[PDB]
RNA sequence: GUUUGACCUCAAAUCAGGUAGGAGUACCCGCUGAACUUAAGCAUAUCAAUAAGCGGAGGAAAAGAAACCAACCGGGAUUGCCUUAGUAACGGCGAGUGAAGCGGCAAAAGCUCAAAUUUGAAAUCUGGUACCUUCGGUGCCCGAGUUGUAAUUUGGAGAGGG
């Protein structure tokens, strides 16, 4: 029997990684945020889903219809940028962050984590990209985080940082132990 | 062949032991993927033992010959 | 008693001719370090402890053409700045005669280095540093190259000869030959106020 | 520029080679041996100068038992 | 050559150009002024001495004002729109002189102007309206 | 800015994530053909700085080279860079290679990532920061060492060093070995 | 006269274990103090050779150190 | 021309044929083949010292 | 200096006056192109390096950032008004400079400038 | 006479950028240490300075850099063996 | 959810349109590349970084705005001509090879990105369609893009405000 180049390609690669060794850095993904509290951290950000290019639009076409016959409050959205996100952090503006665990360059968001932690911003790893990408409109992001929550939802933003810290922070602080992919 | 290099040139005081510490489809690729001495080359090598113009120049030349020899 | 070692560097603007002076040197100095061409300088200092290099002998060079050779010792050592002008090395034929390599050396000094408080002070360092201790790592037993020193009209003269026995004894000059001027000279290693100028 | 200095440095440098075998030494002071444009009398002085510290030398280790003529059975490198 | 060969045999004519008397005689085209008293006869550096102009700033190589009054007579021969000017009226018929209370009118002044810049913009309403 | 993080990064090459990063690399290139096109750059700093841009009209390119060069000595001193590109230009010779960066080597084989633009696409052609690209003058930089890599080969580089190439060997030689004679000889 | 300085310890040239350098027909030549030499690879180097022939290798596995992140920014 | 002449190709006969050493061009069926080329001397050749 | 084959690349300037004939016409045709301003831009004296030659005061390329600073304009406008700038040269000499500011003092009274319309 | 007109590039040498600074040694800790790195402070836990100067200078060009490298080593050392 | 959908990678269309081969070849840009000949017979050397061959461009091409030249009361993109000069330098100082700063003149144009958040609004752009005042412009729509398209900026600074 045959099959495709590419799929044995893929397929070998999947058994290469879980076999590898990969040092500490490396595999600091995949100990992802348990379903719930990620389905819950999904739950909160869809409300801050940003406008899309329809919406705004729309916006804008009612807003000059307006003028043509003759104030509102700072907009609020979730802030997704990689190099926007970048450089919210390290400024101390950002109150959660959330990181793909399959971002095809892996050196691309490696110190990420790091220097979440370091700056001491609280940060999460959720599984696909593309869940983080369906939720702004783009088809990937990598990253999302917010900066400024509503009121109402400030609770609900700091309940949520505080779960989430017991529940990524403090059970994969040992992240840094013995390197993973020691499968035989 | 760069283990024998390796041993010839440890065995002169080039360099010590101080100097040298200073899946099965992938592994198959890993196997196949420095400096050589000719002398070491060579030491394995043996240890893997089990007219008228004609006229007139030639004329011409004996005359050149004759005066000159 | 006699435990010395002697640490030799390149200066930028090395030439051939001092390339050849500094090759024929650790022929005939078998203690001697050599390492690859350095520039600034206080580095030195470090490098002795590195090779434990009880001596250093930095070829200074402020020109392409012109050589200055430094002799000092790395931790509380006098500094002399020479400058050598006849940059004659075993490259010339004229020295056909041969010294066995490692081999120690007889040293002889002229009376005239006892006449000045310089001269006796520059005595010092040239007894030992020419020197090469006998039972060292790299050293030989017999004694087959002699080492001179002169000096007149206030430059000293270098100089060595082969030591050749017929069936006594006769001489044959050998090695690099070249004379050498005192420029400079700094209490410390390459460092403190200075003690004599010619 | 001072004795003051030369003496300092002297005395801090200076070692006991007197009280040591002239093997220890190596390093013999031609006496009256006090030396130029003729390029060939200062090259006989000089031979002279080097010929009475070989003497010296020479006789130092005839002092000793250790052989002073080469063996001529040692082929080691040569310079 | 081999393709002029041809050419020249073959039938289709050349392209004959002929420039070399235009190369030479070319006409002033950069200022009215100039052409009407530019005299091609003269050389560049003669006319523009003749004109007065500098032809060259720098030492020339080798040994060598009406106009300019024409030339000086040439130097002697934006409203704010509906909606800013609406705006500030509103700005002076609410707060009138009061640069710093319009400063900080988070209702009117949205965009946080400085003081200067209203009062400036307030004097050329002032000037361009009542 | 993350392309200083990802610039910092790539100089620790010899690190443990790097190193591995490349053993697998170079296993997935190794497994597909010699010249493959990628998706996406794998040093997106590095294309950055190199003149990328994310629009319509940029290519990235990967090609596989061999190592090495007395039968063999011979130098043969045509680049290893200077070979891949102009390989990828002839792949793609209706593109135009721009530059090349290093990404990853091997014992046996080097490999290198190629920018390429197409001069035909009307958002390079509109862009009047690329449109330079399309002069008819910039056909195939590669072919004729106009690269970065081409010209530092050509040791084209102000100052006494490069005297000899300062503005080509092959000119400079012409021009000194040709003899001058004016009507009124001097 | 003189100048601040410290009086640094002297330096012994001894020859360390390792230098770059080894240590020293009816004979063998002549060893040091002129006697006549009288005629008459470690397992560990051989293996070392081998190890290196496949970039066999101490413990590389050991947990990461967050010596910098530790400090959180202030 | 600095090609007058040169657009041609001969070669000497050797010696001894009875016939001069000046090179003769080659071929054959054309009547020129034979002929002398690259001489002052040949007709059409070149000739001596060109006016540069 | 004949160990070559020189003879196949002999140049000889046959074309001296033809090619001062075009020089004058391309020198012409920038003028009627340039007509209102000068040929050349107003450059700044300078003293020259290579002390054999130090005595000798020659052009240069353009004046410097301070040098136009002191004259009274900026160095952006200054390009538009034909003064050659220069980023790079360094002042060294008072001398110099107070003759570059006249210089450039008494170019800038010395030129007209129409209206930008 | 003398003039300093004006400054030059060269006069950007500044201070480090202490968010480079940052960087840099972010970098550090997530890098890790290269291969002949782990030899120097290997050698350092029990040798010190003496043989990771000789390694280091042996890698390296230069002494200069050597003993920078070594410099970085003991600041790395001193850090992850008290925070 | 024994399901449906997101992505990432890889396929095929006689899918809609573009791009490439090749020719010419004096000059231009790279690769490759000898001999005859010249020397103290000859390996260094000279012929030669040439002849021929290969690849890639236009009316010119390359290079071009210093990690330059210099040691001065310092010059300030590259290129071209006299001179520097048959000097420095190289070459069994052997035949011979052999430059460059400066000086005089032609021409003189500067610049564009990466790296600090548009973050109070991916504001960027290709493509398809209906029109028009069709070398292109407007509305509509799918898409490229957040693994970064718009604005500003390159130390000559530069950026947030009054």
Redesign the pocket.
Known sequence: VKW?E?VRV?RQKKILSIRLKVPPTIAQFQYTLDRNTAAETFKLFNKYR??T??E??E?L?KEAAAVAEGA????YAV??????????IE?K?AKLVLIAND???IE?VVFLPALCKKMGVPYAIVK????L??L????????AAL??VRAEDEAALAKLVSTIDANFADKYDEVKKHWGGGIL | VEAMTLAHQLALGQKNKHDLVDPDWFLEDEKEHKPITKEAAMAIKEKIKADGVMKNEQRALRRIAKKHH | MNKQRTLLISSRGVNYRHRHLIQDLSGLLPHSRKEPKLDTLQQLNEIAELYNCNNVLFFEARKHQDLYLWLSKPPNGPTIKFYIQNLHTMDELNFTGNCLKGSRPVLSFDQRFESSPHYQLIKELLVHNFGVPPNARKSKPFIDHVMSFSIVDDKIWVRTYEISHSTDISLVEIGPRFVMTVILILEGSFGGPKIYEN | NNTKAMKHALERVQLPWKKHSFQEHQSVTSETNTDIYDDTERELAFYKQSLDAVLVARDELKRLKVPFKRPLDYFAEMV | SVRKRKMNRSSVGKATRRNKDKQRKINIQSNPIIAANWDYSLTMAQNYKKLGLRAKLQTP?GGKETEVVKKLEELASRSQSEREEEWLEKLYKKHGDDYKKMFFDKKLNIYQ?????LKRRLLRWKKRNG | ?A??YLEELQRKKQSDVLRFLQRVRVWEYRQKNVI??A??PTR??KA??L??????GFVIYRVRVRRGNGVNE?????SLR?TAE?RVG?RA??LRVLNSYWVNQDSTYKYFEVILV?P????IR??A?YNWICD?????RE????TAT??K??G??????F?????????T?????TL?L?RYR? | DGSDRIIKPEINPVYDSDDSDAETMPHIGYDINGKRIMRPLTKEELELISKIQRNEQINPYEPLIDWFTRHEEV | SEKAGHQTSAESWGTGRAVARIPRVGGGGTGRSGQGAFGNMCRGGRMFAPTK | ?????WQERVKVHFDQAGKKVS?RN??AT?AAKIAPRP???L?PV???????????V?????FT?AEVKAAGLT??YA?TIGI???????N??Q??FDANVQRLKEYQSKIIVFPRN | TSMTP????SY?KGAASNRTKFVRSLVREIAGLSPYERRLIDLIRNSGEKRARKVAKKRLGSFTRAKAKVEEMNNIIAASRRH
Request: charged share 40%; hydrophobic share 25%; proline share 5%.
């Open positions: 495709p590419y893929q940003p406008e290019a329809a705004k639009k916006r076409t509102s409050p700072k907009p802030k997704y940028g990689l190099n926007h996100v970048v450089a919210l400024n503006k971002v095809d360059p691309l696909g990209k593309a869940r990408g369906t702004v409109n783009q088809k990937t992001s990598a990253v900066t400024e | 190589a102007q400085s003081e200067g810049d | 800015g392309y200083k493959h096109r998706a996406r997106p700093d950055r700085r003149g990328y841009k994310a629009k319509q011979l130098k043969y001193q045509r200077a102009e002839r010779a209706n197409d035909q696409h009307k958002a509109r862009d920061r008819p003058v910039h056909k195939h072919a004729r060492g106009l081409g010209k080969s050509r084209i580089n102000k100052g006494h060093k005297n000899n190439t300062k503005a080509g060997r092959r000119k030689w012409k021009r000194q070995n001058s004016w001097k | 200096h004949f160990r070559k084959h020089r391309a020198r920038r040929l050349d831009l450059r300078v003293r020259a390096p290579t002390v054999k030659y130090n005595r000798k020659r052009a240069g390329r353009g950032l160095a952006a390009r050659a700038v220069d980023h790079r040269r360094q060294r000499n001398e110099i | 004006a400054p030059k590039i950007k």
